[PDB]
Design a protein around this ligand. Structure first.
Ligand SMILES: C/C=C\C=C\[C@@H]1O[C@](O)([C@H](CC)C(=O)NC/C=C\C=C(/C)[C@@H](OC)[C@@H](C)[C@@H]2O[C@H](/C=C/C=C/C=C(\C)C(=O)c3c(O)cc[nH]c3=O)[C@H](O)[C@@H]2O)[C@H](O)[C@H](O)C1(C)C
Ligand SMILES: Nc1nc2c(ncn2[C@@H]2O[C@H](COP(=O)(O)OP(=O)(O)O)[C@@H](O)[C@H]2O)c(=O)[nH]1
Length: 371
RNA sequence: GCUGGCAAGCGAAUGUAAAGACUGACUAAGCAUGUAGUACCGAGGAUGUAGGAAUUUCGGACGCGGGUUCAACUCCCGCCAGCUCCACCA
């Protein structure tokens, strides 16, 4: 809160969701150190590339942390698959790539650690070919993707070769990730993802601005679980730096006045007044396929109670279908009505995720609202 | 049925009552194929192998949902209702 941030080199979000205990934290720390040297839980570090300013999100690679990882990847603009070159693909890596494809991460860069732990020039190529084949078979891009090999912990050790290699890694990261599209057309909207309580400052809510801008001193409305209320913003900041306005697409922390830590939970949205209204039941078309798209095999019936993940959080919901469909067997391209317990401010065209038993069943697009 | 040959009175003895074949227009009365009928049932005949009565039970409900030992009413998971532990300072 002592640095006046300059809105140059537009913000781009990059997230590392690589394999567990394969060097994600070490890799991001090494990247930050080498960039700050040559240029002068979800860990949100930042670094200013000469091309663009990036915010690096090291997400937890644990399966049980998938719920917050969903927002971390939806938050994310470019994925970094961090994997060891001595073990190759893993079930955890496959789950992570499936989640990334289901959340819609366009650009992914593969990094191969433990390059020097292997005294050969064929095993590294074999594992690179294997991961490339995995990407090409799991609906991912192919030979037009920069694949990065090298050591993630020696990048911090005194060297020159690996420093140059990681600098080249950062270069094509910023090359392969062009200027992203921002949605500052509609009024301001920001889904909440974390809450902090600053002693002497107050409560601050973190998140990626979905749309619109936030000027210092603007009135906004909290809409979400069990509550729709009003508030005032004072002191827009980003990564402990002074800001003047907050564009859309970057993870920022907005300071709210008259906010209670227990009263405000994750799942709500800070919108412009009179824009969106929370609803508990709405009509949506489902896009489940027969068997090979996450959906189950046996022809289940009504009363299904899945979690409907949204931009922020999820909630257990019920589904009702119009007459003409005796069963709700997988293969549901039809429209139905979904009722949720916790009301969340929603708009037409919203894309949500249907999940159950730790696996995604199908997608859904909001068609109408029944309040 | 009027008549039909005549006895019987015109108010007397007092009546055999078969009704199928054959020609053809057939789409019964333009118009597709005909000599007995493929229709229509309703108290005329039959199904009784399967669905209705009893009779063994499958179905359910211990929070729901389902991929689970079927013996599930906690044999595998995601939630939600409480207890605890921390991560958690734009
Ligand atoms: C994943 C949960 C959270 C997502 C959040 C929301 O997802 C979304 O609502 C999203 C809507 C598009 C959503 O609902 N996703 C969540 C739910 C739905 C899932 C989406 C997308 C899919 O389409 C039916 C999606 C995989 C789709 O398959 C296509 C190809 C198939 C790939 C293979 C893998 C699959 C499945 C598979 O079963 C499979 C296999 O076949 C062989 C081997 N092993 C496998 O395991 C293509 O790759 C498309 O991408 C939006 O992206 C929102 O922006 C969001 C981020 C708020
Ligand atoms: N030998 C070797 N070890 C590595 C390399 N990259 C990462 N590591 C190991 O990975 C560990 C760091 O794991 P960490 O990032 O904290 O786990 P994660 O966050 O779940 O990915 C370190 O102890 C390193 O020994 C590498 O290139 N070579």
């Amino acid at each position: 809160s002592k640095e006046k941030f300059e809105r140059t080199k537009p913000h781009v979000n990059v997230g590392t969701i690589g394999h567990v205990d394969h060097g994600k934290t070490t890799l991001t720390a090494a990247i930050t150190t080498v960039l700050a040297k040559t240029y002068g839980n979800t860990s949100h570090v930042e670094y200013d590339t000469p091309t663009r300013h990036y915010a690096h999100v090291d997400c937890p690679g644990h399966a049980d942390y998938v719920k917050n990882m969903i927002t971390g990847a939806a938050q994310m603009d470019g994925a970094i698959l961090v994997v060891a070159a001595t073990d190759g693909p893993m079930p955890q890596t496959r789950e992570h790539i499936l989640l990334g494809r289901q959340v819609g991460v366009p650009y992914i860069i593969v990094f191969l650690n433990k390059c020097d732990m292997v005294d050969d020039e064929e095993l590294l190529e074999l594992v690179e070919m294997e991961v490339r084949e995995l990407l090409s078979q799991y609906d991912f891009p192919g030979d037009d993707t920069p694949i990065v090999r090298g050591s993630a912990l020696k990048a911090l050790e005194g060297d020159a070769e690996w420093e140059a290699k990681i600098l080249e890694l950062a270069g094509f990261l910023d090359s392969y990730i062009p200027e992203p599209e921002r949605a500052i057309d509609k009024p301001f909207l920001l889904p909440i993802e974390d809450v902090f309580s600053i002693s002497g400052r107050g409560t601050v809510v973190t998140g990626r601005v979905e749309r619109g801008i936030i000027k210092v001193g603007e009135e906004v409305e909290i809409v979400g679980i069990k509550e729709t209320q009003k508030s005032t913003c004072t002191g827009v900041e980003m990564f402990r730096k002074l800001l003047d306005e907050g564009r859309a697409g970057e993870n920022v922390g907005v300071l709210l006045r008259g906010i209670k830590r227990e009263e405000i939970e994750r799942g709500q949205v800070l919108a412009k007044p009179g824009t969106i209204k929370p609803h508990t039941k709405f009509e949506s078309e489902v896009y489940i396929l027969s068997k090979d798209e996450g959906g189950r095999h046996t022809p289940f019936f009504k009363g299904y109670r899945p979690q409907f993940y949204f931009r922020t959080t999820d909630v257990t919901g019920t589904i009702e279908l119009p007459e003409g469909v005796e069963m709700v067997m997988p293969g549901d391209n039809i429209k139905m009505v979904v009722t949720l317990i916790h009301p969340i401010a929603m708009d037409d065209g919203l894309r949500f995720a249907i999940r159950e038993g730790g696996r995604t069943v199908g997608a859904g697009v909001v068609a109408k609202v029944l309040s």
